[PDB]
Each structure stands twice: as C-alpha cells, then as structure tokens.
Structure 1
C-alpha cells in the first residue's frame, strides 16, 4: 500500500432497500474510469455472503476502496434492515463522515431516523445526503418534499440539516452505464455525473479529520477472522497512534482479563502495510490467538495504556415513542444493550434513590453496570437498545469502576 493522498473513512447508511449497496458499487465504477488504481466492485461483490443472497439484504458491513483526485476513501456499506442495526453501528463507528441514502420514492423511513441518531452516538461528524431512485419520481414537488423532510430530520439529531449537500440521482442507472461503458468519464452521462456530484461533495464537505498518531495505540476491533495461511486477523479503524509489525499489543475488554500478543502483520485493503497509523482501516494479524480469543468490541491498545471498566455515570436521553423508542418507562433493573463504538454489551440500570421510574422523552442521569469490562472513557457517547428498538442516547460522565 503506497499512500499518495489523504485518507478518509466514509460509508453508506439509511433505511432498508433505499440503495446503499448499489450506490457503493456505483461509486467504485465511476471512480475507476478516472483513477485506474480503483478496483470496481459489483453489486454481488458487496452483498456476497450466502446469507445475504438468501435473505436479499445486506447483513455484513462491507469495506470497499476507491479514490478521487483529492483523497483516498475507505467506504463502509451498512445494512438498513432493522434487525441488523448492531452491524450498522459498528460500521458507522468507523466513519469520518456518512452518506445518508434516502429513496426519493419512499421518503424518510424509520431507519433513516434511527441511523442518523445512531451515527451521532458513535461520533459520525458529517453527513452528505444522496437522494436516490429519482428515476422513479417524475413529480419535482415530491423530490423537494423529500429533501425538506430529510433536512429537518437531520436538524433534530443536531446535524446542520439546512446545510448538508443533497445530491439527487440514481445509483442503479449510473451503475448500469458504467457496465455498458466502464471507460465512461465525467460529462458523458447525466447519471454518472450525479455520482461525480456526490464524490465532489464528499471531497469538499467532509473534512479530513485531525488524527493523533503520537498518542498510545488504540484500535477498536470491528471484526475478526481467520486467514487460511497467515492466522487470526482483527480488523478496525485505528483511533489513535501507530502499530508496526513486532509490537506487543493488549486485547482489552469483554474477557475477565487483558491478554497480550504480538502483531505479526498489518494490512489495509489486502495490501500489506509497514505501519498502520491513526485513521487507517487495517487488518492486524495477531499471534497466538484463535478467532475465538479476539472479538468485535474489544480494542487493541498499547499495553497498559487502557483500563477496561464496568461501572459509570451517564447523562441519558430516553427516546419518545414517536422517535421509535419505548411506549412506557423503565425502572432500576432495566437490562438493555449498550453500544460504544464497535462494542455491544448488556448493562444494568441503577437509578438514584429519588428516581423510581424513567419515562420516554426524559433527560436523566443514572449509573450503569455492565456485565463485562469494556474500554470506556468520560465523554464517550453511546446508544441504548432493547427489544430490537433503540430506546436511548447517552454519554459517559464519570467512570466509577
């Protein structure tokens, strides 16, 4: 992996079937007619898992690479199915900016809201909107109506909704055009120009993040698998610092105790790296651990730079039924799921002696006790889900134990 341009992590979010995967595929084809380094990815190359073919939806987050003239992108395509929100969050947790896909035909839908909300509670700082399937919507009035709703929906979850770029296009027709002529450059085709229009927005609207490569190494693990000839790979986006082959690193969280290992390889999009730095989306080849000894939700950290915790105080907003949350309140003993970056863990809600009940729409402080240790830190935003439903959004305010 030779690096020439700044690197940025983007991805696709939005409601089920709105066209996130098709857009992703389209992006690779369009980009590759300019930059020959870009490897094109077909629809089936992205939704490739047997279970994805079987069920006809995206299930796993896929990582595709493309590039523009200005920057190198790692793109994380997420599922929109309500049942795979867990995966969407882990994808979003790797994004420096997200492309919210919204179908012009259907308008914003329940996971349009939930994905914006969750993107925030995993720190996604910027959103561009791609209004898709415009080739099915003749009436300009609705298109304006759809934009209006999306811009306002973003304003609710504290995104500059009146400001975000909203690119109107058709992911399918661009992708069809690139299939008919892969050498199709900018300007020759109106649909392919809409993708360029999207690419331009990402280039200019989504800024390259400030990344501290001097702080202790920290990579939240998004995934773990086995490379047949090499070993166990933990993947993820390096949050800070650097990792080289030969470094001792600690696997932190989700197990009773931390374990140390030696990095024996580092790869970004299958091209081996010498070193991995903050921002990079890498695979870290770990030694002496099977894929049963590392998992999604743990972090790789500079040995002893991080202490996992189980108990904290949070400032929490409980969603209203209208925002897709609970219809009724909960008491102490409520045992929902908590999502921090790529981590997902059961915790126990313990309210203050005065507080007997927490109602939807309430802002409240309580203390949470997790059933496994996790890499936490003051100020870390998180999400609460339970019963296939996002119920709350909070932030750690004080680490207790």
Structure 2
C-alpha cells in the first residue's frame, strides 16, 4: 500500500537531514548523487548539510540553509511505498507546511534532543507546538515522534525520558493519544536507529504503540513507519505547480488527497472553472493506470494552457461544487489584536489556499464546553471559540466536516502566526 508522511518540527531540529539520510539508506538515492551534493555543500561552507541538499533544490534554500518549499521524495518500506513531504520549519513558510500536512496520512515530529534546542522548540515561540497542533487540526491523526540529535547529548537516557514526558503531556493537550505515538531516539546525521538498531543506545529496548489491532512494537524509525486512504471519496487533487513540457503539453503536478485519478477521466479545475480530459498520469517518470490517495503525480491534460491553471487550484472529477459561503467553528490561537467582521485572512482548507472574509460572527462559544456565551459578538480575541460565516474571495471548494472530514478542516493565518483553526459545519454550495 501507499502512505504519505510529512516531516514537521522546529527549525534546525534536523528535519531535512533526517529525511534526506532516511531516503539514502532506503535506496531512494544512489551513493554517487550524495557524493556530489556533499562536494557542492562543502564548496559553500556547509558540509554538514549534504543530506538536506537532497530536498533543498531552490537556490534560496541552499544559501540560507532552511527549507522553503515542499519537497516530494519516495523510498520503500517492507510494507508500504512511502512518499515523504518535507515541510519547512520556519514561521514565514508555515503556509507551505499546511498544504503539505493536509496531504499526509501520518506526521513525523522531529525534536532536537540537545540542551537548549528542545526548550526553544517547545517554547511559546517554538514551532514544535504549532506544527503538531496544525497536523492534528488538518486531519493527521497518526503521529511519530523522532528525538533527533541524540549524539549531541551522548545518548543520555534521562534526557530522552524527559523529552518523551514533556512531549507526551503536550501532544495530549493537542488531541493525540500518547499511547498511539511511538517515540524513537535517532541521529539524522550519523544515521543511528533509522533503519537499523543503534548500539549507542543499549538502554533503549524499543518503542510501543497501541493500535486498533493491538500493541505493536519496534526499535527503528523505519519500523515506526511500517507500523502506520480515502479512495471512496470524490477526486480532490490540488495543484502544487504547473509545467509546460515540449511534445507532451501542459502537465499539472500535485498530490491526490481523496478519490482516484486515471487516464481518460474528465476533470474540472477550480477556481479556474476549466474542464478537460486527462491523457496520462505519471509518478516519478513512470506511467500509472491510476493515482490513488497519496501519490504525488504529474498528469497531462488536453487543450489547456499553463496560464489557465496555477498553484492553489483544485482538480476533481467532473462527473462526481463551488462554495458561496460556509459556517464554521473556529478557535482563535494567537492574534495580537481583535478579529471583527470584515477581517479577510487566508484559509488553508485541504490544499486550497484562498483568502476568506469573516463575513459574520454568529456565535461566541466556550472553548472547553462548547456552550454558547454570546450572540453576534463585536469581536474575537486569542482563546475564544466562535461560529463564523465565511465568504471566499475567489471560487473555492469545501465540504462539511461531518460529511467529508479531509475537506472540512482549515487553518487561519495572520500577524506572525496561525491565529485560528476550524471545522466547517455547513456549506452554501453555488
């Protein structure tokens, strides 16, 4: 089977390094290509980023040493064909982190074990807490915590147990069940305990997590991934990029959130409003008979220009609607001021990136009990929960949370953060 995994975590926690090295040991990349990246990285004074260079393809990413856009790579496990979605750990690029997490079925939270790094990551200003919250808010119910950089602390057990304890209390407040989350001590740089059990941690007997089939045990991070698809739902493949290949034509690229895409299917592009036939579906330069949930495919479309469709657009089956307005329950997290009617921030629903206006603040409810406190409040502040009517600036496709969960959850952003996250209750379809 195929599964998607998004790597999230605080900046410099070793996300790209752990991911690039995991892909290497799984045979996803040949040794000579790694040796090339190691030389190029050394020439820029960054020899300690040879594995991150696997994911960082943009010049701006290699120059700053931080991940900016989403990188899609593959490798196989004894049970699944995994597609990793390396998400940026910097605040300015949380938008790309949301469109990448709304895809993944599972999330690997990279936490640095070094002294000072962990505290900075779980701080009120750390992204470790914001990422896990966004992951759970976007649909990712399965979580894997990888305590990276265990080599800097000489694989100290008390330090690992400390990180596991605090992380458990945190993820529990977010909504996750600490018992269903495996904690794996690793070293993204040395490659310790990633695919093979490390000898530097003789105290570590392995992780254990509760599943619907019982208790599963393991030791490595690869085994944690093996211990991890809405194919029955309408097709929803938003675009990440749009390519113009000579001889082939226009080839949009993206990941399949729900449903299945196949050659010959009549698809519709929203908000563009363009319907055409899919000629072929490819996955890493190999043609497929079909793209199921999870596959980051590149499909060729007929009679459609690269100017008619762009990044942010959502593709779907034309035979199996748009949104004029939708009421949704939102929770203000961090907003330095007040949220009044007219406020038009950007909402990240599944992989759609549209600016929606807080048309009307219907009700203000208590975040814990859900009981209504005030009708038609003048404004909202950090900590408040409320039922708000939204109106997208551009055509957008959303569904009720109760009917289609993957398309019913979204994120609100502004003033340096994710000011709110919510679930759609009802939708007024066009």
Normalising to structure 1: TM-score of the pair?
0.85
For 1:99 and 1:152, the matched residues in 2 are separated by 17
* 2:307 pairs with 1:312: no
Could you tell me whether the CA contact under 8 Å between 1:14 and 1:80 is conserved in 2?
A: yes
> CA offset at residue 241 of structure 1?
3.1
Per-residue CA distance 1:2-26 (angstroms, 9 max, x = gap): xxxx111112111111111111111
* 2:208 pairs with 1:212: no
Secondary structure at 2:393 match in 1: strand
User: In terms of mean alpha carbon deviation, does 343-352 or 77-86 score higher?
Assistant: 343-352
User: In terms of mean alpha carbon deviation, does 86-95 or 116-125 score higher?
Assistant: 116-125
* Structure 1: gaps (5+ residues): 1-5, 33-37, 179-184, 320-324
> CA offset at residue 309 of structure 1?
0.7
* Residue 282 of structure 1: aligned partner: 297
* 2:65 pairs with 1:56: yes
* Residue 39 of structure 1: aligned partner: 29
Per-residue CA distance 1:63-112 (angstroms, 9 max, x = gap): 11111111111111111011100111111122010101111121133211
* 2:188 pairs with 1:198: no
> CA offset at residue 372 of structure 1?
0.8
* Residue 246 of structure 1: aligned partner: 264
For 1:187 and 1:165, the matched residues in 2 are separated by 15
> CA offset at residue 55 of structure 1?
2.0
* Residue 20 of structure 2: aligned partner: 25
> CA offset at residue 190 of structure 1?
5.3
Could you tell me whether the CA contact under 8 Å between 1:312 and 1:397 is conserved in 2?
A: yes
For 1:381 and 1:188, the matched residues in 2 are separated by 39
* 2:248 pairs with 1:226: no
Could you tell me whether the CA contact under 8 Å between 1:132 and 1:168 is conserved in 2?
A: yes
* Residue 212 of structure 2: aligned partner: none
Secondary structure at 2:395 match in 1: strand
In structure 2, which of residues 374, 378, 386 is the aligned counterpart of residue 356 of structure 1?
A: 378
In structure 2, which of residues 77, 81, 88 is the aligned counterpart of residue 72 of structure 1?
A: 81
For 1:355 and 1:156, the matched residues in 2 are separated by 27
* Residue 396 of structure 2: aligned partner: 374
Could you tell me whether the CA contact under 8 Å between 1:30 and 1:196 is conserved in 2?
A: no
Secondary structure at 2:278 match in 1: strand
For 2:246 and 2:18, the matched residues in 1 are separated by 31
> CA offset at residue 121 of structure 1?
2.5
Relative to structure 1, the CA distance from residue 162 to residue 277 in structure 2 (aligned partners, 3 Å threshold; closer, same or farther) is closer
> CA offset at residue 162 of structure 1?
4.3
Per-residue CA distance 1:332-371 (angstroms, 9 max, x = gap): 1122111101111111112237311112111111101110
In structure 1, which of residues 237, 254, 262 is the aligned counterpart of residue 277 of structure 2?
A: 262
Relative to structure 1, the CA distance from residue 83 to residue 264 in structure 2 (aligned partners, 3 Å threshold; closer, same or farther) is same
* Residue 3 of structure 1: aligned partner: none
For 2:327 and 2:6, the matched residues in 1 are separated by 31
Could you tell me whether the CA contact under 8 Å between 1:265 and 1:286 is conserved in 2?
A: yes
Q: How many residues align?
A: 369
Secondary structure at 2:243 match in 1: strand
* Residue 153 of structure 1: aligned partner: 170
Per-residue CA distance 1:168-227 (angstroms, 9 max, x = gap): 11100118x99xxxxxx8468659x999700101111x2xx4x324x5433232333333
User: In terms of mean alpha carbon deviation, does 138-147 or 325-334 score higher?
Assistant: 138-147
Relative to structure 1, the CA distance from residue 262 to residue 360 in structure 2 (aligned partners, 3 Å threshold; closer, same or farther) is same
For 2:150 and 2:297, the matched residues in 1 are separated by 36
For 1:187 and 1:382, the matched residues in 2 are separated by 38
Could you tell me whether the CA contact under 8 Å between 2:184 and 2:219 is conserved in 1?
A: no
* 2:185 pairs with 1:168: yes
Relative to structure 1, the CA distance from residue 229 to residue 56 in structure 2 (aligned partners, 3 Å threshold; closer, same or farther) is farther
> CA offset at residue 57 of structure 1?
0.7
Normalising to structure 2: TM-score of the pair?
0.80
Secondary structure at 1:172 match in 2: coil
User: In terms of mean alpha carbon deviation, does 307-316 or 155-164 score higher?
Assistant: 155-164
* 2:151 pairs with 1:135: yes
Secondary structure at 1:113 match in 2: helix
> CA offset at residue 247 of structure 1?
2.1
Relative to structure 1, the CA distance from residue 141 to residue 241 in structure 2 (aligned partners, 3 Å threshold; closer, same or farther) is closer
Secondary structure at 2:63 match in 1: helix
